[PDB]
């Protein structure tokens, strides 16, 4: 409950207050692309994005979420492996103090300079609290950060920044089309696995994307400014906010294509 990202409370110590942490589906992973099963079966994926109401930007000490209002069905994701209808409720990023290191789940051991995490919850368990609790309760789209060319849809993300350094600060973010940080491609590989942060639930459908999008060295620079800490507190530089990956156990990661 003290957990973050450092040598005392990181990723190795997590276990001790969430044994889970050890469980038989826990995320991330490494996809090896050639070991992925290619499953003609899997459907297109649905990214109904159009009507998405984004509220208000909060930096948790962990990471900076971008928040929708999710009282409605307004931006959802459906089919591929879903059964059912998601809903978007929240965006945040994981990402490194270097551009060779930042990405959860890694690509043949490859990691890229940061991931993006759309979160959404399956409506037939009415809230997301409910959703959490099962199996099928959320479908995470990942999608993955290079650094080269800005991508212009995350700019106002980077610009807000500024205004939300610290621990607990929010500011408002309305109006935010997430349609503006997804790649042309939504070619995936999907497995069954779990949160990357405590709780570490294992409720989640990993739906990640195969092209990353390319942000510029400026933008990713700008993630690298937040702080972990509260106001006025010693300084600790947000970065490195992501888990390594997790053993496989007994999963098949699927592949959309071939
Ligand atoms: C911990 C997990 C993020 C794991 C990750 O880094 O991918 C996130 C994703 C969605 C988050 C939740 C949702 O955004 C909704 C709630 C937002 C509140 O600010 C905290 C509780 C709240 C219930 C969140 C708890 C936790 O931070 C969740 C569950
Ligand atoms: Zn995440």
């Excluded at 000490?61 to 089919?79: I, M, P, R, T």
């Excluded at 709780?199 to 972990?228: A, D, G």
Aim: neutral net charge; proline residues 7%; contains cysteine.
């Amino acid at each position: 409950h003290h957990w973050g990202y450092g040598k005392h409370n990181g990723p190795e110590h997590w276990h001790k207050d969430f044994p889970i942490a050890k469980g038989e589906r826990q995320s991330p992973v490494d996809i090896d692309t050639h070991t992925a099963k290619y499953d003609p079966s899997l459907k297109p994926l649905s990214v109904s994005y159009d009507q998405a109401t984004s509220l208000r930007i909060l930096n948790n000490g962990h990471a900076f979420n971008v928040e929708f209002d999710d009282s409605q069905d307004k931006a959802v994701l459906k089919g591929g492996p879903l059964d059912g209808t998601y809903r978007l409720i929240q965006f945040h990023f994981h990402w490194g103090s270097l551009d060779g290191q930042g990405s959860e789940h890694t690509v043949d051991k490859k990691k890229y300079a940061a991931e993006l995490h759309l979160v959404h919850w399956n409506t037939k368990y009415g809230d997301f609290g409910k959703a959490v609790q099962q199996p099928d309760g959320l479908a995470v789209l990942g999608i993955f950060l290079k650094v080269g060319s800005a991508k212009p849809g995350l700019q106002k993300v980077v610009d807000v920044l500024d205004s939300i350094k610290t621990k607990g600060k929010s500011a408002d973010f309305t109006n935010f089309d997430p349609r503006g940080l997804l790649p042309e491609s939504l070619d995936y590989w999907t497995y069954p696995g779990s949160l990357t942060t405590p709780p570490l639930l294992e409720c989640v459908t990993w739906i990640v994307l195969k092209e990353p999008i390319s942000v510029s060295s400026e933008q990713v620079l700008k993630f690298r400014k937040l702080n972990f800490n509260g106001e006025g507190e010693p300084e600790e530089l947000m970065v490195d906010n992501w888990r390594p990956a997790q053993p496989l156990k007994n999963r098949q990661i699927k592949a959309s294509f071939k």
